Amino acid sequence: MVMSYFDNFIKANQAYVDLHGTAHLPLKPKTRVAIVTCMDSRLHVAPALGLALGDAHILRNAGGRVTDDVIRSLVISEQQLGTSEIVVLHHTDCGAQTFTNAEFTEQLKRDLAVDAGDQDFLPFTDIEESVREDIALLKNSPLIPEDIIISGAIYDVDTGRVREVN
Template identity: 45%
Template sequence: MSATDEFLTANARYAESFDKGDKPMPPARQVAVVACMDARIETGRLLGLEEGDAHVIRNAGGVVTDDVIRSLAISQRLLGTREIVLIHHTDCGMLTFKDDAVKADIEADTGLRPPFALEAFADPAEDVKQSMRRIANSPFVPHKDAIRGFVYHVENGQLKEVHP
């Protein structure tokens, strides 16, 4: 049985007792979370999110890319969020490689060098600050007065705040 089939079995159980079908589209707590895709980060549990509470944007690293700016622009302009929470974490995959080396590997395998940055970084807290500066520098995110950044510790479950 594939993981996807296991997901469908779990979803059937979830839907059986589902009682949240009347939640509105705009996030109740008016916040957008930007976090790494890492499998150990279970955003709902570690932040205490209920269905309907917050937008959750995730990618490799939790870095603020143009696609995150797109998502934040839609989140704030069209769906009313006002706070942003950035979450990087310890033991991140992005700490284990350098862009140039992976680009060279990809080029060796495919013949094509990727036309995008891989976004590897050397320190999660420093990269949270980089992400904060990218938002500060973007004209497309209208509300910037409630942005906070954290490093999540996969070894003990704790969020630690990064002060810019």
């Protein structure tokens, strides 16, 4: 077997263990916030938002889109883990703006021999509108209560800035 970047991460983790020492924080996030954002490698959510360890739940998927898994995860965050505020954070230069479902599902048929023509990969073109659509999906879900403040924002991957949309 050939080593990969996982082995690099295991080695690098030793330094973090030495800094972290032995210290327990509560399962319930201190700020009562859950953030929904993209997986993008150029977004490190804690320094961008000023999070201390234990401050907020961080949910991440392709595009920061609201899905059944995001709602599942938020109902656990809120009803089991005490959170009561949501931030939907999309970002500039997102991979979701680089394909359409039709073009991507043709590519998958060619490359993987799978027909995913009926599956929605959740692309978008207008970042602000994508944030407003995902906030509406949360507000229309009966699993997300009404006394939950939901904010929308955009992270600029070139500058580090977070700016409100919703």
